[PDB]
Amino acid sequence: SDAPPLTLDGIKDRVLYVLKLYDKIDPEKLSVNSHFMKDLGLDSLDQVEIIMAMEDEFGFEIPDIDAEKLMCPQEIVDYIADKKDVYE
Amino acid sequence: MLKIILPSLMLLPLTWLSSPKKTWTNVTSYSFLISLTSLTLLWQTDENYKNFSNMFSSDPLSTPLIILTAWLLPLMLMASQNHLKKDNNVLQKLYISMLISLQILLIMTFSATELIMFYILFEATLIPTLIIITRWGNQTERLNAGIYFLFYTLIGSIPLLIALILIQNHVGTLNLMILSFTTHTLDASWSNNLLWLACMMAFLIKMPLYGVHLWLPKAHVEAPIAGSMILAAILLKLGSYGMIRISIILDPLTKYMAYPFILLSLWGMIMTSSICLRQTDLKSLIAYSSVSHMALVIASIMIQTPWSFMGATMLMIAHGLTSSLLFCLANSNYERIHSRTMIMARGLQMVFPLMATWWLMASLANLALPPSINLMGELFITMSLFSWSNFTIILMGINIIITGMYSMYMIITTQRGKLTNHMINLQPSHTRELTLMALHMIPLILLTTSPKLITGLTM
Amino acid sequence: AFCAPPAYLTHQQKVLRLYKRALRHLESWCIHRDKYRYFACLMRARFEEHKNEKDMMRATQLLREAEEEFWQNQHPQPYIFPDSPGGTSFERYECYKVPEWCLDYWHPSEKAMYPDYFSKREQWKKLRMESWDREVKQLQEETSPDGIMTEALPPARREGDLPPLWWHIVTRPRER
Amino acid sequence: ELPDYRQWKIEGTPLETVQKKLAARGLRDPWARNEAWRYMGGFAGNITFPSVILKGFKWGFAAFVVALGAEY
Amino acid sequence: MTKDMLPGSYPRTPEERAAAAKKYNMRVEDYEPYPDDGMGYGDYPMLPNRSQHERDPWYQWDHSELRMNWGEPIHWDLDMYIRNRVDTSPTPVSWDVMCKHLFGFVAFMVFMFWVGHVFPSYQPVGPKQYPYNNLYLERGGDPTKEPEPVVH
Amino acid sequence: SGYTPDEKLRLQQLRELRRRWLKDQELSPREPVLPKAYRSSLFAVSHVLIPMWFVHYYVKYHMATKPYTIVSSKPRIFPGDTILETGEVIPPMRDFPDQHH
Amino acid sequence: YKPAPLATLPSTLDPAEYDVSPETRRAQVERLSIRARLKREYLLQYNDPKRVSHIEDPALIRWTYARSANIYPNFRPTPKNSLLGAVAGFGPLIFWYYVFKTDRDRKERLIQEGKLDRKFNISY
Amino acid sequence: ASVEPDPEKIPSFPPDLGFPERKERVMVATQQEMMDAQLTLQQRDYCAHYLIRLLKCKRDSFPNFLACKHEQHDWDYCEHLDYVKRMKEFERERRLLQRKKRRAL
Amino acid sequence: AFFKAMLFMCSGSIIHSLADEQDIRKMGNITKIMPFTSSCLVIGSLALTGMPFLTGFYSKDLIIEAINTCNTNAWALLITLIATSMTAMYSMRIIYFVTMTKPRFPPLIS
Amino acid sequence: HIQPRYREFPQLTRSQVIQGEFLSSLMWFWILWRFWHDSDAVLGHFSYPDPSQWTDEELG
Numbered sequence A: 001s002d003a004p005p006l007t008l009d010g011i012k013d014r015v016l017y018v019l020k021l022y023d024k025i026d027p028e029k030l031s032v033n034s035h036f037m038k039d040l041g042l043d044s045l046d047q048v049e050i051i052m053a054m055e056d057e058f059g060f061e062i063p064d065i066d067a068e069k070l071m072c073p074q075e076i077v078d079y080i081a082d083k084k085d086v087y088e
Numbered sequence B: 001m002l003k004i005i006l007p008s009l010m011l012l013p014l015t016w017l018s019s020p021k022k023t024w025t026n027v028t029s030y031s032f033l034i035s036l037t038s039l040t041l042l043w044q045t046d047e048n049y050k051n052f053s054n055m056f057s058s059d060p061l062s063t064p065l066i067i068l069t070a071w072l073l074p075l076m077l078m079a080s081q082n083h084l085k086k087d088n089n090v091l092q093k094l095y096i097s098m099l100i101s102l103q104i105l106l107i108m109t110f111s112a113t114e115l116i117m118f119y120i121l122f123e124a125t126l127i128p129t130l131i132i133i134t135r136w137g138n139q140t141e142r143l144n145a146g147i148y149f150l151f152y153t154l155i156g157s158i159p160l161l162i163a164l165i166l167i168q169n170h171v172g173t174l175n176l177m178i179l180s181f182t183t184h185t186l187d188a189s190w191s192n193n194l195l196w197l198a199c200m201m202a203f204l205i206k207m208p209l210y211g212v213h214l215w216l217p218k219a220h221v222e223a224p225i226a227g228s229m230i231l232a233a234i235l236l237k238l239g240s241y242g243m244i245r246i247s248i249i250l251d252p253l254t255k256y257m258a259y260p261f262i263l264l265s266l267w268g269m270i271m272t273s274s275i276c277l278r279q280t281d282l283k284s285l286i287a288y289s290s291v292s293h294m295a296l297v298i299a300s301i302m303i304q305t306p307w308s309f310m311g312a313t314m315l316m317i318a319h320g321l322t323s324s325l326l327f328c329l330a331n332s333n334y335e336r337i338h339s340r341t342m343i344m345a346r347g348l349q350m351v352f353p354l355m356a357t358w359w360l361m362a363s364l365a366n367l368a369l370p371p372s373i374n375l376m377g378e379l380f381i382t383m384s385l386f387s388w389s390n391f392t393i394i395l396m397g398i399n400i401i402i403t404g405m406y407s408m409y410m411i412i413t414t415q416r417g418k419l420t421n422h423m424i425n426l427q428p429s430h431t432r433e434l435t436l437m438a439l440h441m442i443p444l445i446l447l448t449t450s451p452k453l454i455t456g457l458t459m
Numbered sequence C: 001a002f003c004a005p006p007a008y009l010t011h012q013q014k015v016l017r018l019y020k021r022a023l024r025h026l027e028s029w030c031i032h033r034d035k036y037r038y039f040a041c042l043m044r045a046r047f048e049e050h051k052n053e054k055d056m057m058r059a060t061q062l063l064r065e066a067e068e069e070f071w072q073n074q075h076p077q078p079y080i081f082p083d084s085p086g087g088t089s090f091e092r093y094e095c096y097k098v099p100e101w102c103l104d105y106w107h108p109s110e111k112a113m114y115p116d117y118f119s120k121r122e123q124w125k126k127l128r129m130e131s132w133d134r135e136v137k138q139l140q141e142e143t144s145p146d147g148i149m150t151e152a153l154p155p156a157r158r159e160g161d162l163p164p165l166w167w168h169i170v171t172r173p174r175e176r
Numbered sequence D: 001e002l003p004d005y006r007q008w009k010i011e012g013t014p015l016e017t018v019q020k021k022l023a024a025r026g027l028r029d030p031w032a033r034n035e036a037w038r039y040m041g042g043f044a045g046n047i048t049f050p051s052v053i054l055k056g057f058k059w060g061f062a063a064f065v066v067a068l069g070a071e072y
Numbered sequence E: 001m002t003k004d005m006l007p008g009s010y011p012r013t014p015e016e017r018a019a020a021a022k023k024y025n026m027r028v029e030d031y032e033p034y035p036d037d038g039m040g041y042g043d044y045p046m047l048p049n050r051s052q053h054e055r056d057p058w059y060q061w062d063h064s065e066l067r068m069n070w071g072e073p074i075h076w077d078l079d080m081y082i083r084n085r086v087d088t089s090p091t092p093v094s095w096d097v098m099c100k101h102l103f104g105f106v107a108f109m110v111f112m113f114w115v116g117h118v119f120p121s122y123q124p125v126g127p128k129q130y131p132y133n134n135l136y137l138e139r140g141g142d143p144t145k146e147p148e149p150v151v152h
Numbered sequence F: 001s002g003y004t005p006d007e008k009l010r011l012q013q014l015r016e017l018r019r020r021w022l023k024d025q026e027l028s029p030r031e032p033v034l035p036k037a038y039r040s041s042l043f044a045v046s047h048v049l050i051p052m053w054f055v056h057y058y059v060k061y062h063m064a065t066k067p068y069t070i071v072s073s074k075p076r077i078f079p080g081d082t083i084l085e086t087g088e089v090i091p092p093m094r095d096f097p098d099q100h101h
Numbered sequence G: 001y002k003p004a005p006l007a008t009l010p011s012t013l014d015p016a017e018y019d020v021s022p023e024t025r026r027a028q029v030e031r032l033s034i035r036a037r038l039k040r041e042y043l044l045q046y047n048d049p050k051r052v053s054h055i056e057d058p059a060l061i062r063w064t065y066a067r068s069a070n071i072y073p074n075f076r077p078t079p080k081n082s083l084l085g086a087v088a089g090f091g092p093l094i095f096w097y098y099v100f101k102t103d104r105d106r107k108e109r110l111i112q113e114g115k116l117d118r119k120f121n122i123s124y
Numbered sequence H: 001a002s003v004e005p006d007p008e009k010i011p012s013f014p015p016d017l018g019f020p021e022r023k024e025r026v027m028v029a030t031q032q033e034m035m036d037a038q039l040t041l042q043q044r045d046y047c048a049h050y051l052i053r054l055l056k057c058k059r060d061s062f063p064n065f066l067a068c069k070h071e072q073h074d075w076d077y078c079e080h081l082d083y084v085k086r087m088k089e090f091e092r093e094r095r096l097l098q099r100k101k102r103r104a105l
Numbered sequence I: 001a002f003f004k005a006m007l008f009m010c011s012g013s014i015i016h017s018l019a020d021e022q023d024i025r026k027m028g029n030i031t032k033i034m035p036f037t038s039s040c041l042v043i044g045s046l047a048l049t050g051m052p053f054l055t056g057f058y059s060k061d062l063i064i065e066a067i068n069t070c071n072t073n074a075w076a077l078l079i080t081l082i083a084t085s086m087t088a089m090y091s092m093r094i095i096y097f098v099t100m101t102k103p104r105f106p107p108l109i110s
Numbered sequence J: 001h002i003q004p005r006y007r008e009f010p011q012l013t014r015s016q017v018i019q020g021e022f023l024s025s026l027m028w029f030w031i032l033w034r035f036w037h038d039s040d041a042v043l044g045h046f047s048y049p050d051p052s053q054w055t056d057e058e059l060g
């Protein structure tokens, strides 16, 4: 009866919101097209850390082979959205 | 009685004397109008059974079977309207000139006072059934079953032709309502003991035991839509009807002699219903359920208690409408997918919402849903058998435990689940194959309300 | 659900998955949050230790033997999200996902209501009919003749073309 | 919408006094500033079970002594 | 459909196995039928007894709700291994120890009733003393046949 | 493990198509054409009054007219009260010597 | 962890998926390059304009034929099959016969005295 | 069991033995007045005379149903006695059982 | 019929207010966020066990009284008395992980 | 009305909290108004009579 329809900006302003809490990367100098492994200094293990917050932010636990692909935080905004059928 | 069949004779010119785009409407129209004329013989104001003519008669056992036979005709005459839609004018009339012969012959059977007139009509109803299957069947195996249906039957029916002749030579007349009076007991003699098998097995071929029943799946699966109705609704019962008749002249030596076939049914009344769980084809599935239920009639006549006959007329006729119903339900999908398998379409009720209500109300007729006539039929037969021996419920209960599974599993894996979105060819519902189901249930809704009509000789 | 799983190309995602499974089979044991936030980093270090080995035998014999231990230390009722497999809300709203071909069976008095939706739908069917052979042709002249084929997942090469198989992915009904 | 990402400090929470035992081993826990929206803001963490088993005891007991002196 | 597109009869002449697997769309080493011990299992494959639960509840199968694709030969007993009837999926507790704590818990928990029925928790009191004899009448008894001698 | 480029237009061209198809939104401007006391003091009339006229006509004039449809138990007589058919008045009960409480 | 025919052991045990070998890895490739020849033939045939009818699914037609019309052509009467095929048809059918005749005979002789004084019954 | 030889299996009155002039237990309620008040069979003790009061108040004082508490105390007290009267027959039979072994010398 | 017609009725007030989640694990501050449902759930669960007049007494008391006042059994008493203190435990578990234990559920307060 | 709050604790709308505080407050009136009156949840008031502390008077 509640939980209004999220549309792509309450995601993007909310994904990047999350990444700033991580404290091991992202010193308030990241961006939306900022890859992880090559220009932020993460491991692959440091990436599984990331997706779980997003999983813990919505509740639709990402399959095994989709966290493998999602590196840029735009790509996270880009997969959340194609599924939940945003932009009506 | 002649008033009821002689019009049915006159539907047969009408097909050939009518233009093609006006002959379905007429022979559909008046066949309902025969049912009313075929319904006056519920005027049983006294126990004095209605003996119109010296050959014909009526009976609270026959009278349901008379009335059902005239009611399946418009039902089945209409179910083959879209089947054989594109074909010749003449076949489109000849199938009707054959599917009416079943009305006439079968009414002459249950109307009969004798066994020979019943006998020649016990088998003359076979020409219009072997011809439906093999000439309009949509499968290669149409012939292997027509041979089965032809030859499982006659092997049981020709000794019946040898016992009926002998009872004449011993008595002279060989009819009902004399032999019931001139009923001299039997001396339990080997000579006098094979006569049971003679005058009992032809009727146990039709009511399929756990042996000879192989004609029952092979025939249904191949019959287009309507050589499964009449083959299950009434022809399947036409075996039972004779055993209520002919078992009167052999009552002392069926106390002990029926323990095989009281028991060859009850066991296979689980096996068939167990097969019915784990079966692929959908039209092969109503069949095995029809053996499990008519197996309870075989184990009805062989106890001879009064409720056991009541539990047979209520179970025969009730099975006759829910069975013929489910075939319409299945062939309402075979006309779309053109496959009998039950997993190919597994997620309907998104697309056929109202038909799902007819699958549901039919499954509950398939199982025992109490305020009804199937459960009344599956109960009085359960009570007779309890009185017969109190360890039958260990068997009769396992079937009930099974019978709630497949009749649900049919609902699950055809109307519940993710739709088969690779089927553009699911036209929602014709108005014509969606009144077929009404012409089955509303009878059950009404015949459930006054089942004083549907009882037999006893009540 | 959108990308195909092939035969796994490395030992990596056999581990990045075990850090995904077991890490989720700890919040169930650690129902609270601060407790869970402590025993996770101690589980972090157990992988940040033995990080890079180059001895592939002993790298697997830590991995294979993790589930000779993990299996006997996981939770029977973990926390699986709704909309995920097994847990509730998974197929809940699938009864209401009709497959969108059935909408080409209405008639006037049923679809003549709102003629605007169908003012679009007709030219979608033209986008689909005027793009099929041009699609299969791109699938046929693809450089995928021999051997390996996961799906080849071909895109529309950069022209006015419309991509490979898309009536699946577009036009799939809406989740809820 | 979405308040600032500088208000969710650790200090005072139970995470404070959970970070010590990780600093005694040296891991630093990169998270716990995301999973910290529940201790410091509004949810001033103090819920003792003798506050829901007898919630409303004050007014109701105060409402009894009326009836206890309404027999007259 | 074709005659030699459907199943057959126990492919001897191992060149037939090379044809059967390409008929069933299977790798040849993966193909082995039932052991030819009579029954009607012909050239139809074995397909180790997976249920349709441990198949990916993820990747978007064609035969969704059944976890199969357009080919990939169907299991023989795919009327129990569908995802409605039977689950051969893994289990956190081993089977043999599952079927020990269950019948072990019950069988002990049964025997503890017998020990109780021998030593029931009875109240240190006598029986009920009813007003009349045992009332004898509204409990069931005719006052034309005898009365009874009992009295407190 | 990171979206190879040829696995990126297939995953973007479908979006602008989906984002467009998914924008097959119902036209809020205009869509299907479609050519207390009064709310409570008629319900009871409709359902609590008129059916009572049908049931009471059934229970008073078919059930009461048949022998054993309506059969009660006794009205639970207790000593020290009369009866409204004969004036029987039944006798009272004896001593009750004492109690202690 | 001790497996069983049910409760089968997972993929993470059971040492497949570990041996990335030149001959164990080629199987998974062609075992999957047939899965992509085939999904492809469905996806290309699923959403094809003018496919009007359903997808025939011949793998299901090979299944039903195997199970109801390729059985008796592959029947060879052995032992393990005929003793197995007589215990099933006549075994219980003979078991219950000695269960009912005993009851009918028990019940009958109890009538002949009157030791089965029949309760207020009309069902016969 | 911290052995108990055989205090009470669970009978009462195998002997009616004792002191000479033991009185007879007396009922207060006439039968036809009492059964015809539809009291049940498992529920009719010698204290069925206080319970028709318990209902002749509950029947006539039908509203303010909290009116018969002064008459349930009358009944249930009488039913506390009979539970005690039989309890004396436990201890009596006990001591008697101990007295029948006390005379084993 | 006034407890399970309440607790479902009062827990479905949660399961629909927040997301479709319905486990104790991922939700834990229903008192301060819902003073209503966390007030009537107690009236259900506290009336479920033994609270001396809340209709888990006028039913239960005469049962727990009658069961240990009758020639019934020995083992079937204990494993009901133990279970009588077990309708307290899991009812103490609903009122702890859902109603106490500072929250754990996704941020969006719908 | 429709006012989500991603984080910090929301508004109360004083009909959940007053009815919630009242339904629970109505209890301990009734529980206590019933305990002041109907304090028979402890032994009743019928004095379990000392199983064997009567010295054989009124014993046979």
Ligand SMILES: CCCCCCCCCCCCCCCCCC(=O)OC[C@H](COP(=O)(O)OCCN)OC(=O)CCCCCCCCCCCCCCCCC
Pocket (backbone or CB within 6 Å): B033, B036, B037, B039, B040
């Ligand atoms: C659109 C059709 C509308 C049909 C009418 C609507 C009302 C239907 C009511 C149906 C309920 C009754 C059904 C059963 C009635 C049975 C009556 C019967 O047939 O018994 C025989 C009776 C004659 O009695 P009998 O003893 O033989 O001797 C009479 C001496 N004169 O025979 C009779 O003489 C009376 C027969 C009455 C049968 C009713 C069915 C009539 C339908 C057939 C006629 C169709 C006409 C078509 C249009 C013709 C062109 C104008």
